[model samples]
Target chain A: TLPDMDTLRERLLAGDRAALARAITLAESRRADHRAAVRDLIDAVLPQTGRAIRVGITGVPGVGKSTTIDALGSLLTAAGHKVAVLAVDPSSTRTGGSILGDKTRMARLAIDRNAFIRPSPSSGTLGGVAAKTRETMLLCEAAGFDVILVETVGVGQSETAVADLTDFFLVLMLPGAIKKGIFELADMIAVNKADDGDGERRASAAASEYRAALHILTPPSATWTPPVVTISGLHGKGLDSLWSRIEDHRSKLTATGEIAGKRREQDVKWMWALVHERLHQRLVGSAEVRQATAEAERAVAGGEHSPAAGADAIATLIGL
Target chain B: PDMDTLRERLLAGDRAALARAITLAESRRADHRAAVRDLIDAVLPQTGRAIRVGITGVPGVGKSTTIDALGSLLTAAGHKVAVLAVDPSSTRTGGSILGDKTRMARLAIDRNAFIRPSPSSGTLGGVAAKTRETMLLCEAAGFDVILVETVGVGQSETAVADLTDFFLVLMLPGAGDELQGIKKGIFELADMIAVNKARRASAAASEYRAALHILTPPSATWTPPVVTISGLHGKGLDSLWSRIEDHRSKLTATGEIAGKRREQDVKWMWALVHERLHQRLVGSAEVRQATAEAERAVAGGEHSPAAGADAIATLIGL
Candidate 1:
């Protein structure tokens, strides 16, 4: 049996990990009553949210992302900071295919009392999964987690989702290999596996290559130029420097007020996204719209009605 | 000067009248807009006959040289061609480096061709509307082929794509650093991609072909073909034109051309509606004040965007 909202809220604020877990599960629930309860709980804890430093991490396949996160997560917990790790894997379309946030992958952090790791929501659209992960991050913050790490694979729209929801976007790349277009959106680029003797030279070369490529692309902000850092996540080398750079990024963005500005923009954009999705759902659900839209689609497909006229017919039918 | 005579002369294929009518369509004045609408209505039956094509490429991709080569070839084949440009940046600055007559030196002097630069100034929607209206005027003036050019940057490419039947993307050779950010679903938008300056960049062209092979075409009926051309030396224009002809025939055979045109027409209507609605919201004084306050709160992190948006909607009486 599930605890009541007030009980859960009190327990969560008191920093009970199990209560936090239960609350997040409720937030992830699709049931109407559970959703209402989750909203109420979020409203109660809204003031405690937004205290954590949210960071998004992504990398192409075989880039040692799991190892990096595990090492970094342990280091963070050892330093007396409570951390929360979450994954966003929209690619896990099937119920049993999800491998995100596997406790086996983050051995030490999974067992650590100071750390809480949650896998991606089982299955849904990318937006749905992302929205759930975002709410879970808020719940973690309310539970007194000071740092939140969101991870996603580089393929598909998952990277974009994580990047949009986080305060900083960190892209992991292999030594001497940098893929195009993906790094352009990163706040920090790191070349992992820089521990071995020859690994150092290869990592430096990769950094230079990336620097040259990044120089050609315009930075999204005038205040921040994405810096490349080399780290051996396997051996936990260069983790301190990476953390310091992240701190530097947070300090700069905070000082310039861009952090708050970005978060607000994100919130507004999220609202619009929800509005669009809801409008689409309503349009599809309407019997009138369904009939008109079907006729319009057929006409459009059959070359009988221009897309412009067909769209107009549907829009007019829906009273848009 | 009068609307009837101007309409008559424009329909009669008077170059001066055609240019003048285009200028009228681009005007922001209310009276001019009514006149433009009336003129378009008068010529509505005469439009939609020409084969419309949209061409796009980034700044350093030799777009002008390729267009010059292709335009001259079409005119030489006895097809009356009209070239128009949609420059979104020029809409704000009232100046365009693209669509300059000097850029297409050969086609500029060809008596059988008409080359008009983008309208001097307006919003992107305004510019697109003027360009679409102008294309109709050109078709009414007996041009059998209309080529619309737009810069690759910004939303102009999508705008131009919606205005034409066939969309072609011009690309530079070499995949190393030149291909960064350029390969983000752009292949899906293009009907054909021409690797310009192919004489010295043959290897790069092959590399692009390989890269293109991996991407799934947006349409199951049409696979985007990548062709190599050297615009400077006027090489491979025949094959490029042939590929375009192939596309037209294939789409025509499948009845996709007419369907595409209909889709574009409907999209244009919605675009206009959206633009007008946005303008209305921005133009409202009360709504503007409410929006500004909400934005400030959102920016300061005091209010969530969802709350701010709800506040703005209430202020606007939505």
Candidate 2:
């Protein structure tokens, strides 16, 4: 039998791992009663939330994101801080492997008692999955996780709602980086795999391009300049400075009240996003609507109708 | 019908009627939106009634002086010319054209020419849409040579390019210059590159030729030619006109112009439709009430945004 909310809340407050997993599963559930219960449960646990330093880290598949996260989380746990990790893979749909499922790759943190790692829901749309990942982050915090790391594969066309998911987002890069909305999303950019002489040389060259790019961008804050550094995730090098830089960003943004403002904007944005999601879901749940949508798109490509006529036809069918 | 009367007057080349029709098209009212739609539909066949030539350049290259010289040449040779701009640069009052007159001095005084700057202060979309309507109105009024010009901002160039039959890039001659500060993408949009205040052997002229050699032409039937001219002396202006005529005949023969025009019409159709449907996302009184509650309650701590959406969605029976 599933445990009740009374025990879940008390055990979660004491930082029990089992309660944290059940609560996150509850939040991710689509069943109406389960969803209602999760909403009420968050209300009870709200006081213990927002205490963790949430960091969003994004990099391509070969960028050593897993290694970097494991090394960093291991450092923090050894220094007496409880750490948690969550991944959002919007591209996954019973298809290509997600970066989230590679817990074994994050070997040290995978078995560490002081660290808790969670994967995104196996299947959902970007906003649906993002909402659960965010809710899962809240659940981890309530269970006394002091620091939360959010991970996403950065190479995909649908980058991530990951930017707003975390307080400070760290962008990982290699020597030759194609240039990734970085003007706003990146708080600190660390070029990984800089363990050797030639590697350090190329990483510095790559780091300078970021510096020039940053020069052309409007800084996201008046008080802080987003930093570019080089590191080696495999060798566990330069991560201490990376951690220091993150803390410095949090301190400055918090002191200037920009953190509160940033969070308020995200809350309101997602609030509207939720309404649009459900309405579109309402629009699509019917097979007739899907047929129309499919034909409308095919007709557009086949030159039978204009995208204009297609949208009008779809809208009229919805009784607009 | 008032619209019928307006159409009749516009077809008769009444300048006053043409201007009034454009004002109605640019209006920001629901009824006016419907009126303009009716007007455009009635006059749709009359548009592309002329060869629309879009001209643009860096300010230092003397666009106004070049336009004055070129337009004066066209009107002198028995052509009715219309000069319009695509700029996100206005919402100032009607007297704005007086300031516009100072730029195109000779064209301003020509009886056969009409000059209109973009409306003062609006989105690029609004300005572009109004320019499109204004273009149709001018064509309806029997203007055969349309010169659409813009230099205000970046994407404004694309708007000018899309609506025109031929795109002319004005350049100046210089050494040690950075490709004359032309955006590489602009070359793809250009049908003819016209060098202002210069000669064939000039350093910058050769440099532009070098750059064009590297750019892929937008049409297989027509490669963009470098035409030289002097806005100061009106030298080579005839050759400029001849080259533009060549591109029209070349592309028209291949039916590229017809294909391009149809593509533009379809794109314009979708843009208007998208904007209309987006406005109705909360157009109904019932939907507006639900959105208001969501917006208000989400900002306050009383309701979670997710729960706020759930209630609103079901309230609308969605």
Candidate 3:
């Protein structure tokens, strides 16, 4: 039998492993039945939600986020921290299903008892994160996960949205490459695969360029500056410094009260955005729009109205 | 239409009804919009007969105060005025505050003037939230003059100018080198540029005039005039109105108005069709499910967004 809301709530509050997965699944589903429970679960856990550090990682395809996350997760776990990784996958080109393969790439972390790895689809929203990824983070936090890592597809404008949602966003890059635009959307820049001799040289050069660029475009509100660090996930090089920098950034944010303030801001923004999007859908889905557009399309095709005039007629029809 | 049944009766020639009707149109309200559209349709033939002017300025450039003074002066001279103020889309939430009433307090409360604030609502270009429809609505409401106000930060404001007959950009005193940071493409669309807040007491008249001289003229068959005005004291409001009237007469005489409105009409068609396609892409159940699924796929390396967008479009029948 599927776990009911009360049971799930008890298990989640007790930090049960299976309950966390079930709760996230419920939150992720679009089915109406799951919504009430998801909302209650989130509301109940919200007080505990803001405690964890939310890190978002994005890079182009084959930048080895899985390998990096696996190494990172293992390292964090060794340091006596519970790690929750929400890996967002791109949709299948043919089947329209998510492969959820972050576990396959991050094979080591998949087996770690302290690490909880779940792969979700990017949901074709402008944001790289899944629609419920933010909600899932809260659920994970409630389930006693101390650190939340959100891995997104290194895509275009979507990365910008992901950047806004996360606390510390890091863009992983391969050295000497076309230099991925992912750096523009991130706070911290890391050049992965630094073990090879050629890779190390390119990583150094890229890091220097990034350091100079950050000085110019850094947002005014930024309290602590992001540093570019080079690391080889294969050899585990630079992993310690990476964690240290993150810790330093976290401390600065906590001390400045920016972490709590930003989290509150994000919560408000997310709710308002949801409302606006839902309202837009209702307006667009109205029957009156259907009738008006259908009539106007015919008029435009028949040359009774110019395409421009046809648009006006449709807007007039929709009362826009 | 019977006088009793007309909105003018319920509104008591208040002009608020006209403003409200335009806002309803902007929101894409279903039943209310149907009523608004019919009201505008009844009034359409009487519109396109006004001096349509579009004004734009960066935030803190005194845009509202300038427009308020100009609008009040025009109305005082027996000209009924309509103002369409476009607010910026919130960067965090992508929603507009729709607070034109608060900003243009005088005009919003005026008996002869109609003021409507339209939300940007994720629209990429500057034509915030049903501005074209509202423009038509204001015309139908019997306003002799219509002014479109845009948040003139950069590229977005230029789009507003394209939909109007004349575009005026307002610049503050001492906004010299920062002018380069402003989008230059707007210059092509602008009919006039106003150096606002040029009170002689604060700054010499010669200094404002010299600043205007340094600004380059846009390349067009007609030169877009640059004027300096102090909005606080109602200085140069009359001259600005006359300049707008002169531009209207010049455009009409040269037969540019019809051609321009025709261009706007064509643009409106593409915009409407594009918005429909956008709606369909986002609203389709399959796409919504697929979008959620695609997010998972992309994150897992199943496929990229370029391909995902293609699938979403195909699923939506775009």
Candidate 4:
């Protein structure tokens, strides 16, 4: 059973907590009815959305994304902004369920009244950004949350995808020598554990190296360059400066019209990508593929089509 | 036969119909797909008769402008020219532009030329999505000269070489680190190297000429000729065309053309199948659902991408 579109939209727009959860649930679903309902709800609440600053955070193993985000969430909430956290767990290779339960790690912030945090499974999708991450951001915005933080699984390629879809992409790196390719995907870099003695030294070195590399690849044309910062997330050192820098970046981006342009382009790209993926899914999932593949395999086994020719024959079947 | 139907429509000059037929061939519809296979089988005898050339270079190496001029010249000589521009896929979005028609603006308008821009679809080669099918279709459409233009001289461009009879690498005259910058892998794959934009007033054609003189061809049997072409004003395209013709005739005379194409077709199919299995194992609904978990575990210092891939294989019954 589903709620009426008008009622759901009204509740969501009015910032009803239950409506926000339901809207996220519906949007996450691929079921026909749920998708239809999600679309209708979005149409009704589109105007109310687009107010929040969508931030994406990613890090490698033990880089402390949850801890940092939790600490950041506290700072943000204290600054008088409602924050919605969508923590996406990396999909399990075995069961495909998200394993790192953010609620357990961010216990302190979870209890904050101004903070709404939901832990999601990655579902083994291509990008670290979950299928409903964008839509979930919309619902959170509609519910009057001024800041939506997206925490992605720490895979390199997937993190890049998450970065592309967000307004502010932050990589929470450890205080170590910067790797040759680490800065390629990140805009802003933050070294965790700045309060620790060795960590502070390492963070400073990493920051300088990253600053040198940024000169070659060139920063995105948002007027504000992606500055490297050091923060001890556990002790919450340098958190205030982080917020100010993010605000500065946002202001310049908005003022220069890059923020709005990026969002529009992102939306168009996402829609087309979704369409392509859907088409591919349908083709591969079809019975023709199954039968043709089976026949080709048999042909290859029987020496009718050589392993290579067999492949071509199958491709020939699929119109390759 | 579906081939006859496709061939008839194609011969009758139905570009849209041919595209639609190719789409069906690309799909997983059994009957439509089988019909495509049958059609390709029918047209197979007609193929291997054309000068199959693969042209590749780095991004902004004037690949489109070069192909446009080359294809136009071939068509002007009363030869049916087919240009297939392979668009690279996006790693982040898993999408592609598929805007070759727009890129090769002039070629699309040529009556004697057929131009198709296929999304690379993460094919890891310069070949278009459903390249082999498009090649056969072009042959059936009476295009005797086919030029396959890859996105650039990258990993996928090497894949493009697996499909063509002759591989042509286009180079800019003044790429500062020409030898070091242009990967040795690309040089090894080329059958002919064309220095484009030779007409630029201050272009370093002399340096490129010297470079070409010293560089040995990739293969021993056929010495890859280094030529200059100013594609903008249609300068020196005939020499490049003749080089391709010479390469094709020589390969054909030695029965290498048929052997190479046959070898290529086999390689193409196997590669496509491998890709299918890999994508299937990775993208299966269950595996897709499991990917997040794998990522989380990896993020938590519990597993690696290789280990995660193994788990995906196991989950998919591979």
RMSD of each: 8.0, 8.4, 12.7, 13.7
Query: Ten consecutive residues with minimal summed lDDT in candidate 1 chain B?
Result: B210-219
User: lDDT tens string, model 2, A45-85?
Assistant: 76688788989888767878898999999999999999998
lDDT of 4 by residue, B19-129 (tens): 766665554344565556655555555555578888888788788888888788788789988777554553333434355467677888887887765533544531343
lDDT of each: 0.73, 0.72, 0.63, 0.64
Clashing pairs in 2: B90-B120, B90-B121, B91-B120, B91-B121
Candidate 2 local lDDT, B86-195, one digit each (tens): 76555334315444677787888888998886754235655665676678778878999999988465467777887788889887665443345355346557777877
Which scores better on DockQ, 1 or 3?
1
For model 3, how does the per-residue alpha-carbon lDDT over B16-38 read when each residue is reduced to its tens digit? 56656655566544455445555
Better of 1 and 4 by DockQ: 1
Once fitted onto the true fold, the runs of candidate 1 whose alpha carbons sit more than 4 angstroms away are A1-19, A29-48, A92-103, A121-132, A175-179, A194-208, A286-307, B1-300, B308-318
lDDT of 2: 0.72
**True contacts recovered per prediction:** 0.17, 0.19, 0.07, 0.08
Q: What is the lDDT of residue A292 in candidate 4?
A: 71
Model 2 chain B weakest lDDT span, ten residues long:
B210-219
Clashing pairs in 1: A306-B262, A307-B262, A307-B263, A307-B266, A308-B265, A308-B266
Model 3 segments more than 4 A misplaced? A2-4, A28-31, A89-101, A121-129, A154-157, A178-184, A194-197, A273-320, B1-127, B131-318
Model 1 error, position A81 (Å): 2.5
Docking class of 1: incorrect
Per-residue lDDT tens digits for candidate 3, residues A295-319, read: 6665544434544356556545534
